[PDB]
Amino acid sequence: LSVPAEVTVILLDIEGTTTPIAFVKDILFPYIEENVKEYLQTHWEEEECQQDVSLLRKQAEEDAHLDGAVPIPAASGNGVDDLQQMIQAVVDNVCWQMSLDRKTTALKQLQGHMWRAAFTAGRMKAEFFADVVPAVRKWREAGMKVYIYSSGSVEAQKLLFGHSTEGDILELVDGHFDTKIGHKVESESYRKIADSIGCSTNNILFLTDVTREASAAEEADVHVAVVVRPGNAGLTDDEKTYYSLITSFSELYL
Numbered sequence: 001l002s003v004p005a006e007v008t009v010i011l012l013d014i015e016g017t018t019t020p021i022a023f024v025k026d027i028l029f030p031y032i033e034e035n036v037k038e039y040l041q042t043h044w045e046e047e048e049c050q051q052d053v054s055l056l057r058k059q060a061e062e063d064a065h066l067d068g069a070v071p072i073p074a075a076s077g078n079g080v081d082d083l084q085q086m087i088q089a090v091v092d093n094v095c096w097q098m099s100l101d102r103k104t105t106a107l108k109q110l111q112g113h114m115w116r117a118a119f120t121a122g123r124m125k126a127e128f129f130a131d132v133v134p135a136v137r138k139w140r141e142a143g144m145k146v147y148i149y150s151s152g153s154v155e156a157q158k159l160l161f162g163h164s165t166e167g168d169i170l171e172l173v174d175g176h177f178d179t180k181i182g183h184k185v186e187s188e189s190y191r192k193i194a195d196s197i198g199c200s201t202n203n204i205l206f207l208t209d210v211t212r213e214a215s216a217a218e219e220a221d222v223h224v225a226v227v228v229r230p231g232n233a234g235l236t237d238d239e240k241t242y243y244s245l246i247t248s249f250s251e252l253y254l
């Protein structure tokens with residue numbers, strides 16, 4: 001509710017915090033499965049697409065031992081028939097990786113390039129709860145710095161903020177962090193985030209919906225608040241009593 005005087009930075013989780021889970025789980029990711037074949041068919045000749053498929057082929061070779069693994073065999077030729085077969089293999093491999101929650105760099109890389117087309121072309125918009133932007137603006141007016149921490153790549157994060165239901169709000173963010181800085185349930189990740197930002201762990205207030213993230217940040221001597229939004233995983237009675245909860249960014253007083 002009332003931020004400690006020592007806080008100078010607000011670190012924000014995305015899914016379940018600034019953005020509903022429904023958008024991420026039922027819109028953002030399913031979009032990939034629905035568009036990967038069309039995307040590959042249309043942009044196969046692109047140097048970037050060729051590089052993406054190259055990475056996916058390498059990954060497919062490394063997963064060859066896994067049961068149910070989908071191979072991306074060497075093309076049979078360079079005719080349109082051979083290409084159709086190739087494309088199907090890549091599509092099948094991508095969907096397979098997504099069915100299990102395998103978030104490899106090869107997969108994330110292609111997803112990011114596909115999302116760039118979706119958001120830039122205005123086919124999709126990143127959903128933010130109505131209280132987010134106004135609160136963030138006031139926070140910044142009060143001198144607070146604002147950073148984002150999500151498992152989604154920074155490149156993908158920028159697309160979300162650049163094409164939100166609130167328009168382009170990239171300027172409201174001072175920086176982004178993804179799994180490169182470490183995993184969200186590891187306290188060490190938060191100590192590094194403080195280092196990258198250029199502050200102390202105690203100058204940070206992290207807002208997240210998952211308690212496993214909250215407890216990891218607390219262990220890193222970071223201040224935390226648990227955000228409750230529609231569709232979020234329930235909190236235990238003890239967690240509801242232990243953590244400071246907020247149902248809106250407006251509930252935070254500086």
Ligand SMILES: CCCCCC(=O)CP(=O)(O)O
Nearest residue numbers: 014015024150151152153156
């Ligand atoms: C661009 C990808 C989706 C990002 C939504 C996420 O926040 C997931 P996570 O809960 O791993 O931080």
Ligand SMILES: [Mg+2]
Nearest residue numbers: 013015016209
């Ligand atoms: Mg979350």
Ligand SMILES: [Mg+2]
Nearest residue numbers: 191194195200
């Ligand atoms: Mg440090």
Ligand SMILES: [Mg+2]
Nearest residue numbers: 006201202221
């Ligand atoms: Mg202290």
